């Protein structure tokens, strides 16, 4: 026997450690169904059609019919062109504490989002204006996974790779905070006020997008902050001590941890609010960094020495990224390969593993 029986000369630069990362497609379990051939998934565990046409057929894109004259159609309605109940004069927010009156079944949807995120997140939720169409929002498994997380538990914290459009579900989550809780300050943190407004600037682009029963009445609408009639508010800031200790946040979100210089005396100020007293609720997300603050984060969080609940999603979470060239579904084996000799193997863990170093 001059060699084994049956192993798989198939190279892939990402098995080419002491380790089997990602296993050949061949080897996967397959079935028809519906007349078509499916694939599951060694990340997901899930199945896939072999054709990427038809994964396309399975993720329409719902289109958004606007709608400013018929009220029925509540879902949709948005008094427009009624000057009275507008945030001056803006054709897509609505005034403050402004009355209406509602149906049985408009509550029940109300109270269908206020609990069910996921259902608001895939229902409501919309992306985009003046281009292509204002359109439902394609929400990614790995998205819903971090609503439910961060909707469920006080304390979040996500270890992302890049390129997975994270801002997207941040966005949404606070939309759905501020809109369905009265009287809560929300805060975002980073590095830069810069980063901040962004996502700030994001969350509000889903508010201004929502139907009028579901949009609250604007109060402010600034580029560092936004207040409702509800008395919730969320505000844009430089993570630093005063702006931590300036305020009483019910809800504090961080994106970049990792990269903030001198985190440890932003981390001083808020622990106060995290541990016993009020409890806000903190979410952090993040992409590894080296071996700083966050590394003992993750790890106490990883293990369980932390209240902090630990969630990671890296690059296999787009889908798109398992379907070849050839529009077949190989699970991803052709997009990193050809991402890492569009680079390195070394760039492409610290970009897309969330590997730390």
């Not at 400013?68 to 897509?92: H, I, W």
């Not at 932003?266 to 952090?284: D, F, H, T």
């Not at 690059?315 to 991402?339: A, C, H, M, P």
Request: charged fraction near 25%; proline fraction near 4%; include cysteine.
């Amino acid at each position: 026997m001059e060699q084994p029986i049956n192993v798989l000369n198939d190279f892939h630069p990402l098995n080419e450690a002491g380790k089997i990362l990602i296993k050949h497609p061949s080897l996967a379990e397959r079935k028809d169904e519906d007349g078509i051939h499916w694939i599951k998934s060694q990340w997901d565990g899930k199945w896939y059609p072999e054709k990427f046409s038809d994964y396309l057929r399975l993720h329409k894109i719902v289109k958004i019919p606007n709608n400013s004259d018929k009220p029925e159609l509540f879902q949709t309605y948005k008094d427009k062109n009624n000057k009275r109940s507008r945030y001056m004069g803006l054709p897509n927010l609505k005034r403050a504490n402004i009355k209406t009156q509602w149906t049985r079944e408009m509550v029940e949807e109300w109270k269908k989002c206020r609990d069910d995120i996921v259902y608001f997140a895939e229902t409501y939720c919309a992306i985009t204006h003046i281009d292509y169409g204002v359109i439902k929002v394609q929400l990614r498994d790995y998205q819903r996974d971090m609503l439910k997380i961060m909707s469920s538990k006080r304390m979040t914290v996500c270890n992302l790779s890049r390129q997975l459009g994270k801002t997207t579900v941040v966005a949404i989550f606070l939309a759905h905070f501020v809109c369905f809780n009265k009287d809560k300050a929300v805060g975002i943190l980073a590095h830069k006020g810069s980063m901040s407004a962004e996502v700030l600037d994001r969350t509000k682009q889903a508010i201004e997008l929502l139907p009028d029963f579901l949009q609250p009445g604007i109060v402010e609408w600034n580029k560092g902050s936004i207040e409702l009639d509800n008395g919730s508010s969320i505000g844009a800031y430089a993570s630093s001590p005063d702006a931590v200790r300036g305020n009483s946040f019910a809800m504090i979100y961080i994106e970049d941890c990792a990269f903030i210089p001198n985190f440890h005396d932003s981390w001083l100020a808020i622990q106060p609010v995290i541990s016993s007293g009020r409890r806000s609720k903190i979410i952090i997300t993040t992409t590894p960094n080296g071996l700083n603050h966050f590394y003992d984060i993750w790890t106490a969080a990883v293990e369980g020495k932390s209240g902090f609940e630990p969630y990671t999603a890296i690059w296999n979470s787009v889908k798109e990224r398992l379907y070849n060239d050839e529009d077949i579904f190989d699970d991803g084996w052709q997009w990193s390969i050809q991402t890492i000799n569009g680079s390195s193997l070394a760039q492409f863990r610290q970009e897309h593993t969330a590997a730390f170093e």
